[PDB]
Design a protein around this ligand. Structure first.
Ligand SMILES: CCCCCCCCOCCOCCOCCOCCOCCO
Ligand SMILES: CCCCCCCCOCCOCCOCCOCCOCCO
Length: 772
């Protein structure tokens, strides 16, 4: 619809930039094509397609509308073959917003290198869950999203923490608007598993080995959450949802200009959810607030300030799994899916809040620079009590474990980087040079010396949670950790021929963790980055990349000699093909990949059998593991009304013993989520559904009473999802989501501290949504 423009004539670059800004649209263009040109003045209330063609009046340029992107070109009569990946400067550094695109596929993406590239142009496996996907399938938090992310497998530690694997690894890398958080363990990372989606445009997952922009981190993948932003036109909605197990949700989201001119814009979102659950006596209130304001200091310098807040507050949290595998005498337990071994009062409450500011400046080169300041808090308040151990015993009694952990981490970050194009051998390339600093400080109390507590319960079979709460006594531990990461990085993207793009870059890292443990230093470690992308057709590209990453070990991972293991390292080797269709409206990928880990922390069993250095009591051993696997995906428009996202991933990871490892992640998985928007008589109705399939998965757990190892198997199963929406009104729609249609019962955890969690049973969600 119509928009208030005011773009004075200037360097074509500047105007395209200024237009992008004023229209809330991504504007892509070629540096060399707009260099010795200027725009015609646009002024007043207009529609963007009118506005842009008017701005380009006399420049010899054509416009290509693509969703929330417009890509600007200046055709020649000459042309001798097309440079599909030509260096393109871009108006929004985070990428193309997906909100409103109507699509399940992303537009452009800055996750891999900090350069704005399309999935076809990025030589790494990159999956994105778009704003519409989140809406259509009711994905209200990061857990929901990960469960619909192809190639991810979500598993339960306990009712209030999940594990996300990719490619053989627990994912432990989270970003916001491209800034890494600190997640060395559950100290620094309270709430990461639980972020509400009310404040996000999309989530982007870069599978592989992501050292280049994460710095120090886990192998497997990075998860990158992109915040919602303000708009120059007014808009918002209010949403109310009601689902199984007294699950209630409400949401308000407002955005728009805040001054007659347009130079200060804001966006505000509040979301409140309160849900009981299929698990007995578990409940959880979650509260979220967010505000961002933009200010234009001048047409080419913008300042952004913002804050967000989320509180996750449960009753009946478990500590490990939902129930124990074996009873006292060694038999497997059969329990209702409702069973929950948390105490009534037991709670693993987790909170997060951020204050952040940035400054973005267009330089005249079409170079642009950016300074991000972040202050992040991750806090936890955790009085846990859960039935634990080989129980029941024969007379139906059991025993509780109770411990209390409270704490906060405070983090501060500075990220500064510069991005721009440049001529080299008569061709146009681009570069990102950046540097970053973070300091975080974890601070906690632990309680475990309980005073005069009777931790037996007289009834396993009807466990209700209804046990007393212990006197926590005085703190048993003070935690005081300081981590400090400093990084510098540079990537260059050369356009070597009309169809070869070479990527060369690296990050140099310095990592100090200081505290109550022996200091852990790592200094001037080089993380390399090499990538190539060869065009074959208008449609398909091949690509390879060698990417790297390391995480210095936790301080208790020491060895025979009580020396800290070297940093857990991994390279990912990838070759693949990517295809692109309907002018970027649909993408496909088929990738082959291999990760080589080294210094993987493993037990050291022969030492452990009988420790012989009084120094260390439980040594480890830094071994080598490999992932070998392949992956296929598709996202976007199959036909006009029809969207999909779907993937297939095969994996096996083995360590030096030769044995398989991560054997709880299935070797094979498939995802397919789709919706269809009818046309004509039924054009107000979208229908969708999805299906999630995986193969055999198992664990070795030790049955302690019978003194033997047992394999535990989850046989391959399907989960099926269904979805309907109706736009009753220009401004009001209603929606139904049914999940786990065939009420499959399966396990989300078998083996974690000898326990088991169940997957969600069939559940529905009804919601309405009201757009002002
Ligand atoms: C150090 C703290 C930083 C605070 C940052 C939080 C900012 C919160 O901003 C709240 C403002 O939100 C703006 C919502 O936009 C809607 C305004 O619409 C104008 C009303 O429309 C009437 C006529 O158009
Ligand atoms: C063990 C659980 C089994 C549950 C199975 C349920 C299967 C039936 O699902 C379909 C439900 O259809 C109900 C129709 O309701 C229509 C949605 O209306 C939304 C209300 O809009 C609000 C207006 O302000």
């Amino acid at each position: 619809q119509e928009v208030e423009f005011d773009i004075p004539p200037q360097a074509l670059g500047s105007a395209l930039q200024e237009f992008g800004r004023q229209a809330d649209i991504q504007v892509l263009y070629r540096p060399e094509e707009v260099r010795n040109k200027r725009s015609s003045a646009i002024k007043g209330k207009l529609e963007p397609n009118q506005a842009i063609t008017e701005l380009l009046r006399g420049t010899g340029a054509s416009v290509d509308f693509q969703g929330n992107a417009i890509t600007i070109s200046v055709a020649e009569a000459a042309d001798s073959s097309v440079d599909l990946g030509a260096t393109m400067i871009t108006s929004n550094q985070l990428g193309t917003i997906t909100e409103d695109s109507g699509s399940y596929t992303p537009g452009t993406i800055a996750t891999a290198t900090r350069l704005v590239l399309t999935p076809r142009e990025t030589p790494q496996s990159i999956t994105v869950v778009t704003r519409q996907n989140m809406d259509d399938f009711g994905l209200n938090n990061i857990d929901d999203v990960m469960r619909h992310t192809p190639g991810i497998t979500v598993s339960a530690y306990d009712t209030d923490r999940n594990n996300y694997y990719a490619r053989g690894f627990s994912i432990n890398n989270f970003q916001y608007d491209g800034i890494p958080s600190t997640a060395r363990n559950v100290g620094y990372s309270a709430g990461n598993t639980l972020s509400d989606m009310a404040i996000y445009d999309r989530v982007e997952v870069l599978k592989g080995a992501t050292g280049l922009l994460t710095g120090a981190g886990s192998l497997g993948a990075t998860i990158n959450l992109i915040r919602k932003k303000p708009t120059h036109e007014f808009k918002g909605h209010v949403e109310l949802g009601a689902g199984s197990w007294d699950n209630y949700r409400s949401e308000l989201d407002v955005s728009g200009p805040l001054t007659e001119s347009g130079n200060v814009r804001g966006r505000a979102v509040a979301a409140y959810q309160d849900k009981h659950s299929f698990m007995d006596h578990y409940e959880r209130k979650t509260s979220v607030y967010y505000g961002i304001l933009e200010f234009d200091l001048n047409p080419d310098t913008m300042l952004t300030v913002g804050a967000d807040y989320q509180d996750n507050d449960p009753k009946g949290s478990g500590w490990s799994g939902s129930f124990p595998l074996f009873d006292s005498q060694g038999n497997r337990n059969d329990v209702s899916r409702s069973f929950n071994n948390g105490a009534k009062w037991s709670s693993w409450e987790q909170y997060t809040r951020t204050v952040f500011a940035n400054l973005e400046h267009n330089f005249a080169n079409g170079w642009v620079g950016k300074v991000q300041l972040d202050h992040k808090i991750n806090g936890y308040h955790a009085p846990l009590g859960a039935i634990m151990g080989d129980w029941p015993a024969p007379d139906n009694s059991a025993k509780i474990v109770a411990q209390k952990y409270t704490g906060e981490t405070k983090s501060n970050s500075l990220d500064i980087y510069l991005t721009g194009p440049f001529q080299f051998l008569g061709r146009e390339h681009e570069l990102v040079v950046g540097t970053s600093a973070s300091f975080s400080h974890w601070e906690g109390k632990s309680y475990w010396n309980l005073r005069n507590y009777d931790n037996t319960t007289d009834d396993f079979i009807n466990w209700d949670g209804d046990i007393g709460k212990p006197d926590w006594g005085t703190p048993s531990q003070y935690i005081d950790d300081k981590t400090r990461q400093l990084g510098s990085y540079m990537t260059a993207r050369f356009n070597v021929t009309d169809d070869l793009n070479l990527f060369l870059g690296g990050r140099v890292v310095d990592y100090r963790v200081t505290g109550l443990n022996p200091t852990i230093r790592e200094s001037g470690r080089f993380i390399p980055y090499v990538g190539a992308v060869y065009d074959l057709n208008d449609t398909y590209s091949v690509y390879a990349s060698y990417t790297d990453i390391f995480m210095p070990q936790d301080s208790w991972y020491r060895d025979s000699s009580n020396k800290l293991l070297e940093p857990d390292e991994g390279q990912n080797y990838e070759i693949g093909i990517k295809g692109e269709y309907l002018d970027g409206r649909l993408n496909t990928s088929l990738a082959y990949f291999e990760i080589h880990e080294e210094n993987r922390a493993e037990e050291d069993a022969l030492y452990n059998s009988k420790p012989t250095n009084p120094a260390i009591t439980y040594a480890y051993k830094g071994i080598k593991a490999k992932t070998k696997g392949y992956e296929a995906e598709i996202s976007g428009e199959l036909a006009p009304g029809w969207q999909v996202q779907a993937g297939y991933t095969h994996k096996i990871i083995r360590d030096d013993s030769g044995k398989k490892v991560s054997t709880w992640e299935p070797q094979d998985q498939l995802s397919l989520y789709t919706s269809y928007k009818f046309k004509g008589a039924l054009d107000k109705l979208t229908v969708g559904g999805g299906a999630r399939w995986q193969g055999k998965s198992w664990q070795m757990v030790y049955n302690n009473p019978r003194s033997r190892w047992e394999k535990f198997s989850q046989e391959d199963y399907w989960l099926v999802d269904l979805m309907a929406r109706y736009q009753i009104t220009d401004k009001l729609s209603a929606s139904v989501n049914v999940n786990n249609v065939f009420d499959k019962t399966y396990y989300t955890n078998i083996g974690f501290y000898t326990s088991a969690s169940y997957g969600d049973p069939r559940n529905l969600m009804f919601s309405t949504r009201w757009d002002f």
